[PDB]
Amino acid sequence: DLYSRYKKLQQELEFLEVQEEYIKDEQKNLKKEFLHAQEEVKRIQSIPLVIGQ
């Protein structure tokens, strides 16, 4: 189990390594979706309107 710990840990290494491109995709895409929704709720606001008090 001592020498097996290495070979067993390699799987965890690859598993933790594969998450890099994943979080890259998330952080790059969700900000684009963020500005998307931002402009979506921004275009809701229009100049012509009624003035209250």
């Binding site: 390699q10 799987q11 690859e14 491109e21 994943y22 995709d25 969700l30």
Partner: protein, 519 residues
């Protein structure tokens, strides 16, 4: 995480050590035979059973080899063992007959499941209280099918006939199918009980009883050597529309699974040549089952050629699952095909690629798939492939239950609720049968959300964990109470909410805690 290019040869050259010893070991030969799946590997040990002249040691290996972990390998080894011997002479005959039987296990299982039954009135009373005539009507009978499975008790449904046939709908079909779930492993009393209902004019007003009887028959005779299929062909030859085509495709398709016959393939083709979506979907579901391991050359191009030429979604998803389930051991083969079909315009086929690569890469042997899985999950705007994303992920990562909730922790609360739903299914299938609390402690934020989808998925995920677990070791009291509050909160909740609720409650009460699930 081997690529199988070496390990198979390593094992097959490592199985020569114990045969030279004083006694053989069952564990290593089983673990190897379920891996390399080589017909020549079992070739010596099958013929050594006669040489060793020992009956008791052969029973174990025969039973556990014929129990699972193969289909066509078993179909090959049964005729291979049939060839060996006469076409202790008298002992070898009864031995070779009894080892491939397999009915004994079904008998003892059905028996102990018949005598272990323990039921409570509170649950069924609650179901009869929370029942509706539209939505959860199917949930009640599927819950009944869950709890009454294996005990073959129709006495619960013998209470009243006005709780079933009072209205004409698919609910009666799901009820008959539920009855098919209740009793299983009957070569006589099944068809007998099905024909005992209305053997008068042989013309029932509801065909859902006949079609549901065919589907139930397919459920019962599935994976058996007592197949009525020969009669099922002529029974499918009958003149009808909805039930014969659909129910027949489902039943006969499930009964013919593993046979890999070209006849059922042909009749399935002439069944899907009517361009209809429903019977073609059933045709897809059946084809995926019967063509497993066969891998026909022109089948793929024929189906993908039949894909984009129809606008119906049902035939699309039907062929999707059809080409998804048919793919096994293609890890070193179908990579180019999946990569080519990944860029397709069709969302259904895009999900079909993931469902196809799902079972093919199972066993965590490929780290390449999850790249484009997560990529198409995050990048693509359509919630279809996003909710179809992490299912394959859970399928390939099913080996380690602990690592899943960590990487799906970000998908716990997502942007679109569909991703939360798929992630709920992921936590449901990955943590199923295990004791992992990483999902459990995260179930609390999941049980309450403005969206009903993620809530229902959380109910299912919570249903797939607490099953077969001791209460004294872990504090499940909270989630048990919040699950038991779902039935009293049904009035203040959504119509589908109570549906998924009682459906989640039907999981734990299924089989009376006796039967469980294992990946």
């Amino acid at each position: 995480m081997q690529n199988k290019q070496f390990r198979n040869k390593v094992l097959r050259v490592l199985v020569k050590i114990y045969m030279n010893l004083e006694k053989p070991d069952f564990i290593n030969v089983c673990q190897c035979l379920i891996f390399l799946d080589d017909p020549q590997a079992v070739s010596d040990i099958l013929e050594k059973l006669v040489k060793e002249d020992n009956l008791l040691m052969a029973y174990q290996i025969c039973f556990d080899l014929y129990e699972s972990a193969s289909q066509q390998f078993l179909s090959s080894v049964i005729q291979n063992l049939r060839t060996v011997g006469t076409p202790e002479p008298k002992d070898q005959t009864l031995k070779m007959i009894k080892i491939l039987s397999g009915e004994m296990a079904i008998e003892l299982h059905l028996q102990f499941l018949i005598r272990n039954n323990n039921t409570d009135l509170m649950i069924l009373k609650n179901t009869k209280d929370a029942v509706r005539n539209s939505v959860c009507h199917t949930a009640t009978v599927i819950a009944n099918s869950f709890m009454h499975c294996g005990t073959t008790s129709d006495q619960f449904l013998r209470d009243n006939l006005e709780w079933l046939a009072r209205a004409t709908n698919w609910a009666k079909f799901t009820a008959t199918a539920s009855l098919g779930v209740i009793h299983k492993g009957h070569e006589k009393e099944a068809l007998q009980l099905m024909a005992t209902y209305l053997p008068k004019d042989t013309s029932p007003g509801s065909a859902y009883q006949e079609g549901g009887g065919l589907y139930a028959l397919g459920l019962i005779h599935a994976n058996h050597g007592g197949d009525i299929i020969d009669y099922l062909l002529n029974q499918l030859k009958n003149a009808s529309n909805d039930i014969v085509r659909h129910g027949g495709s489902l039943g006969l398709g499930l009964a013919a699974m593993g046979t890999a016959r070209q006849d059922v393939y042909d009749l399935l083709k002439t069944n899907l040549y009517q361009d209809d979506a429903v019977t073609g979907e059933a045709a897809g579901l059946a084809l995926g089952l019967v063509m497993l391991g066969s891998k026909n050359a022109q089948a793929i191009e024929d189906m993908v050629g039949y894909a984009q030429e129809t606008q119906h979604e049902k035939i699309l998803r039907g062929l999707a699952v059809g080409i998804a389930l048919v793919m096994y051991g293609r890890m070193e083969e179908a990579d180019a095909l999946i990569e080519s079909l990944c860029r397709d315009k069709d969302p259904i086929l895009r999900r079909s690629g993931m469902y196809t690569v799902a079972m093919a890469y199972c066993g965590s042997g490929n780290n390449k798939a999850i790249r484009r899985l997560l990529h198409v999950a995050v990048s693509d705007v359509n919630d279809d492939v996003r909710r179809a994303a992490v299912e394959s992920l859970g399928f390939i990562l099913f080996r380690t239950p602990e690592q899943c909730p960590s990487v799906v922790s970000l998908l716990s609360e997502s942007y679109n609720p569909h991703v939360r739903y798929g992630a709920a299914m992921a936590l449901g299938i990955c943590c199923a049968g295990t004791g992992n609390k990483e999902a459990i402690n995260l179930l609390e934020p999941m049980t309450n959300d403005p969206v009903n989808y993620v809530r229902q998925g959380a109910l299912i995920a919570s249903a797939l964990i607490m099953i077969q677990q001791t209460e004294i070791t872990c504090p499940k009291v909270n989630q048990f109470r919040q699950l038991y509050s779902k039935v009293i909160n049904d009035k203040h909740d959504d119509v589908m909410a109570k549906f998924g609720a009682i459906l989640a409650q039907g999981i734990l009460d299924a089989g009376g805690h006796n039967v469980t699930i294992s990946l």
